[PDB]
Amino acid sequence: EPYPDDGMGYGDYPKLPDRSQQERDPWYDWDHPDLRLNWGEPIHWDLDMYIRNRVDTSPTPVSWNTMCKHLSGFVAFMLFMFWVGEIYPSYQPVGPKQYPYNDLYLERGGDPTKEPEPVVHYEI
Amino acid sequence: SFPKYKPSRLATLPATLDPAEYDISPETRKAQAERLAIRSRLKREYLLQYNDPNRLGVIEDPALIRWTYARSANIYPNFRPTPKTSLLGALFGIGPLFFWYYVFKTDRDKKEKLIQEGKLDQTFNISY
Amino acid sequence: AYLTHQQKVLRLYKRALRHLESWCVHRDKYRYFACLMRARFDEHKNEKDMVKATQLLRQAEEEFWYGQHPQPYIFPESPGGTSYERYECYKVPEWCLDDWHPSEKAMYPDYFAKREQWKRLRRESWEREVKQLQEETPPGGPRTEALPPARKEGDLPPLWWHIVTRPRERPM
Amino acid sequence: KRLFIIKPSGFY
Amino acid sequence: AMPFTTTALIIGSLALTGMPYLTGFYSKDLIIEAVNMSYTNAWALLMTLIATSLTAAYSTRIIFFAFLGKPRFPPLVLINENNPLLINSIKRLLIGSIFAGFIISNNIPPMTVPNTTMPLYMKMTALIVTIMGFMLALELNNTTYYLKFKYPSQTYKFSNMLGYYPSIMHRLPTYHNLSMSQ
Amino acid sequence: LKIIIPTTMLLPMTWMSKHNMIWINATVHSLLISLISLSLLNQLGENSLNFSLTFFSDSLSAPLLVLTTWLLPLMLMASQSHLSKETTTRKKLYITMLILLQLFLIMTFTATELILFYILFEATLVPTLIIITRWGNQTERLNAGLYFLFYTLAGSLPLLVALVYIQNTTGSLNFLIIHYWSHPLSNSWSNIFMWLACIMAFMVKMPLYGLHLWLPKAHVEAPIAGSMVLAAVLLKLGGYGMMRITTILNPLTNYMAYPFLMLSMWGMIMTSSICLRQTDLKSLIAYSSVSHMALVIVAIMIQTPWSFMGATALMIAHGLTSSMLFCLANTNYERVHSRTMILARGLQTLLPLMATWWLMASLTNLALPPSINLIGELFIITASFSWSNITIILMGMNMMITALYSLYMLITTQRGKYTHHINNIKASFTRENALMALHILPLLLLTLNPKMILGPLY
Amino acid sequence: DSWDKDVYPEPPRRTPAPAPQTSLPNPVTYLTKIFDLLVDRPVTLAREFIEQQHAKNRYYYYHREFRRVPDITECEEKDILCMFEAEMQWRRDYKVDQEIVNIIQERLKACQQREGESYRQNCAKELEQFTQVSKAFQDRYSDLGAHYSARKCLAKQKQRMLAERKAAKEAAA
Amino acid sequence: YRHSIFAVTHVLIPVWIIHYYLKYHVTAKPYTVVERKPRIFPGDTILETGEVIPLMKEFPDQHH
Amino acid sequence: GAHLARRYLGDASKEPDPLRMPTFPPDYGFPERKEREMVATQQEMNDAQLMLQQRDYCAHYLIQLLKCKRDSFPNFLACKHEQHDWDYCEHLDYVKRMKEFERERRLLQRKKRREQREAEMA
Amino acid sequence: AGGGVHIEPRYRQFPQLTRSQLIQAEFFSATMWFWILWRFWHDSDAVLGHFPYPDPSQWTDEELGILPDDE
Amino acid sequence: APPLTLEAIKDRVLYVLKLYDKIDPEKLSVNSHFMKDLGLDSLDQVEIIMAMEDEFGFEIPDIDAEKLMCPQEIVDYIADKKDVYE
Amino acid sequence: SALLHSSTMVVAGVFLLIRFYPLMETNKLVQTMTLCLGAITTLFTALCAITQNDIKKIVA
């Protein structure tokens, strides 16, 4: 199966099936057990693509369409109403941190020369 | 019950689920005969060179040498300037270069516009 | 060469109840569904009609792919196990030995002396076994990857050195 | 019972 | 068969689940008491609530399957943990995993505002949540003891593949980008 | 000036010496001349070290010459793997080319005249194509010479016309005179082409995305001695040029820089991504060199103090490591007699020390801290980030790939399972291991005090 | 001491008296005393042996003072002779000003940690000093680029003067 | 002896040169070693000054 | 808690907007405005290194706690009553914080009561 | 490995245990059960809450100072 | 872990096969062919080897499973796979 | 796996933010993803641990 001569320089190089080395039977005696690849037989144009270390296209128990739908449906559930979460924050019936010395204006980096606006809070 | 396991490029269809695997027939029966017969000879002379006592060298793999040429030198000898290669070359060539030109120039003029009247803050930005 | 109708169901059974063991976990639970797996396997033993038998393969595999454990159980030493090719870090081929320095081979003299004798056996039996091979190869090379045995006495089985001198599974 | 272990030549 | 490792894991997991007045509780349950009572994102307080329930859940599963139950291991028993190197190694952090919680909580200077006044329900919810984490997981783990076949659930398939992230993100983005490389 | 005469003095050294002493005599005097060269980082302050009318040195040149003078011993023992079987006269003439090469690079960096720089700048070519084509190994080494030289002259020649034009206009091009008698470059259309002519010559000997076809077409097929010297110092000849020629190309540089630094920016991700998909081991370092070399293209273009320091730091550091990976390429190639990456695997179980050199080489090229690769690369990032905030997403994404292919070569060659049918690898001699040691130690022990390496702007 | 406590100023240090109210023995008191009487003393004897040996012979060094030279402003146009000296002083001033901001940064560096949790208040004056140092440094050498020079800095200096004088003129009206 | 012979070459010879490094080289350079001033509390006394920081005024008498 | 249920599920006007308490004038409804005083002063409050979040109105019950804790070193089991005083003040800080929230809530309820009675009175 | 290990490798039986192996097992189990609930008796307040939380309905308008809808 | 000798491994396989109910505990033999001598079928071999793969921990390959049907030749394959020599 | 990425290495990433805490709390917006990221990570990682089988996968 020569590669489609669309516009590239694949030449007469055959099109081996686009299957990873992992799909090859481990029990079968392989000349290169690291690559699970024999001697002399044609090797894929993308052997590095489909080596065990690199991209693996071995079959999965559940279909690829359902593969992404549940993952995408998962993260979509997170982000979409985490927005709903942040617009309706959860808290306790608490007020502001009533603080002394004009809400620590001086000790929070405020300018000591300029007189701060008095922030005061009486008891209840 | 259970719809199917639909294969994809990265989720391939296993041989167990392959229908043609279970559709054995006489004409494909002899077709799988030479698959191992070709393999058997390729395992024979390889092992012969593998276990030769006087073999002091590297058993060159003609398939490996063919792969190296095909992926390193043969691309241009069998290249053709077909229209498809031009769009692919242009899209992956000057395309991103001009795309980053739009992004980078816009920020550079925007940043230069902001500083020239002093909106951007460089109170402690000295290590330029 | 062939996964004929015999082995396909034999392999199918093997992967079937191994997945069941991965499912039931408990031995008592596994045994009940294993014998049901066995009993349901041979309830249609007398199925002379091969077309239905191949059909019976179809409802064996597609729900096996559905019914297989999403986390399939694999023992460490077998494909996918936690210990597959774990000790390749230590398996060094036998041919590296002769490169040892005179001090290094004087370190273990008896083994090297025996190793030299082992090298002798390969040297004056290689030409005999390749000749034995050639006179028994079918035309156009071999039609099967299986190697012929030792035809007559004395000569070792053809192409024997690496399969015999293979590094041990537990080298250290 | 211990067995001889093969190693690359480390003398060099 | 291995009691020393049995004791270490149970009290190790109990700290992991937040057993009160242990190493885990002084941090984890104090944290839960802190996060739920604050100005924060709405649901974002519920993972740390729900995850804590799941945090206790897999702790029960790991205790139930690995140590409890019947000995499903291969027939030839070579198990042994009587080597002093193990016993001292586990024991060194063992008194740590039991007594550290106090010896860091008291000595360090107070550097956070102490949560003093709160409702009763969420102050105890740091301990309650782990209870059904122990309870529901225990019943679900017991379902393996109940003699009946288990149907493969779609949500169970989701959890077994690490939530589908390694299957996809390690297949699609890596293939497309590096295929572009050639 | 005290460096050049002994460097020429090695020419009679190798050509006369006894049949078996030519390499011993050449190796020592190349090692001794690193003394007098090592006194060139010995430097005054902001003023450059001008010790003669025609020769001068500064903190930018000083790391360069000590690199080249140090370098020649590396190619000397590197060539002592495959030159043994050649005849004596050919062996002597190999040293002649390497020594002639030293005499050039040792003089371009000291040149105080633009033309004198350019004359010697392109003069280094003549020793090279002798090395690549005469002593090359593969078949297309013949095409290597044409690709290398024609690319160089096609850019260098318009620079020569530009230089004489500057000679007629301002009067002189002495590196100090142009600095002190600076003149802003008007936006006239004529100045645009003069700017382009001045820069393009150094761009071609600075592999840019598109002007880099000779990088994989020269380094891969060149001899081992020619491979490192072409990748460690020869690529830096443009780097010295651009750092000097930019003094007369402002303010036209900033507006004209966008077509060039960006092409380096996008290609430097692309070229690094090329290494992720490769079949030839020597092509990895060649393409990895392109990405690393293109990194300083951005730095010089910004003309930022931090960028210039980072450029010089990466310049020497990349040259040292890129040469190293070429030595490791040679040892594996010699043992297996092939340049294919996937052929020789699992070599660490056979050569544990060679794996450590492979580990240090790929990890230094990975540019971890505090290695000179990282500090040079980090200074470029900070300068680029100040120029534009988006620069981090691109040049940072290079470091993404940079770590990948650096470990990819380590994993597929040293790690894994050895291929069984290779019965050629012997224990490594003390030569290559010392050669690797003489590459790795100067890089590591320079890290404690790298201020000789940052440059004049430091 | 060796340095000067006005250009490297150190605020006075206040350390409370040790008043252990508890009856059980304080351990920290024990670790310092064994530390002092087992390690601090031997290194002191080694140091005093070093100091007396260093006092046996006394070689000295001195300060390299550079007299003022005309800058690139009064330097004659195209006059290379005084341009070199003018450029030399400008870059030497760059090194001096580079150390000046280093001194303020080091003063700023020490202030924040020394003040600890209250770093916002007793370091405000240090922040103000750094702010005007940084602001004036940007008015001085900055943004000139890799090939900075006295002429380029003078060019920026003139640019500020024209801008500020014109702006002041129109604003005053 | 194994513990002591290990100690001298692993915990004595380091602190010998470490203490030499800080107290006579690092601390000789100012702003190299910088210390938190100990937090003085109302009622403490200073060894050098001797002045007591006045005790904070009467507490609101909060008892549970 | 309950406040979240009424604010989100029901009308949010009956529940104070969590970023705005207090909205109604504190002086109105609170006579004898002898405002919340300080027993400690910022001098020793700074000298005793206290993080800003800890720099609350309970400051006097951290400083002496840090004192006895330092002076009782390493008896970490002591200085509990001083610690007991600390969270009591923080408790008192929390109740008055509840009082402020409910005071705003009651004013909000009253503010609606004042307006509709004045609105549909005609 | 070498014959004569402190425990012998048996087949399919309950492995032999030494007395010393057991002693530390309930030693830490008892001390952990000591620790987690002795301190419970010490300061039970910690997992009880030192201060009750009153609901916001019982407080009268005196302290809140909030007048009714009257004037 | 101490290694298993040829006697030990033949003794280990002796126990598991003897435990099998389909065979008879007095006719068992080391060279007794499974399907003919003990009267088994092809769909009894499969459950034999997993019961053999269980107590040994490793997996004999499927390609070598169908021919793994003799107790003496049972131990020959395992002894080859573990190279355990007395 | 017991030392590097169970107790020491993986927590070093969290150790960066705490070491920058005096600067972190100034920006309110930066905290919203920290709550966001830490939340969903706890749910997801615990979700996988429930039905995993490898002895180290559960605890990892």
Side-chain angles (χ1 to χ4, degrees), chain E residues 174-175 177-182, chain F residues 270 272-277 397:
Chain E
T174 184
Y175 149 79
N177 282 186
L178 202 173
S179 76
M180 161 275 268
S181 178
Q182 193 267 300
Chain F
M270 191 85 48
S272 46
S273 167
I274 303 276
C275 329
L276 258 206
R277 185 84 89 96
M397 186 166 173

Side-chain angles (χ1 to χ4, degrees), chain K residues 61-84:
Chain K
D62 303 331
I63 187 49
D64 277 330
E66 64 280 54
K67 18 199 195 162
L68 198 33
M69 32 179 292
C70 166
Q72 193 280 358
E73 160 281 350
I74 272 288
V75 317
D76 212 28
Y77 188 80
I78 317 145
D80 170 36
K81 251 31 206 170
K82 324 278 291 138
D83 47 71
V84 278

Side-chain angles (χ1 to χ4, degrees), chain H residues 2-60:
Chain H
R2 242 174 186 202
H3 266 186
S4 39
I5 199 43
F6 164 80
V8 46
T9 184
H10 278 72
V11 83
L12 266 202
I13 77 89
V15 61
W16 290 143
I17 76 89
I18 289 313
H19 213 76
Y20 199 9
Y21 198 71
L22 294 325
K23 217 154 67 50
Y24 298 122
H25 290 263
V26 179
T27 65
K29 251 46 72 184
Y31 294 159
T32 49
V33 171
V34 300
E35 192 146 319
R36 283 279 271 281
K37 68 308 186 186
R39 23 175 71 182
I40 318 85
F41 310 140
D44 306 343
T45 37
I46 286 85
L47 301 322
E48 51 273 30
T49 310
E51 159 262 337
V52 86
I53 178 64
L55 179 50
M56 171 205 318
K57 62 205 65 139
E58 156 275 331
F59 279 155

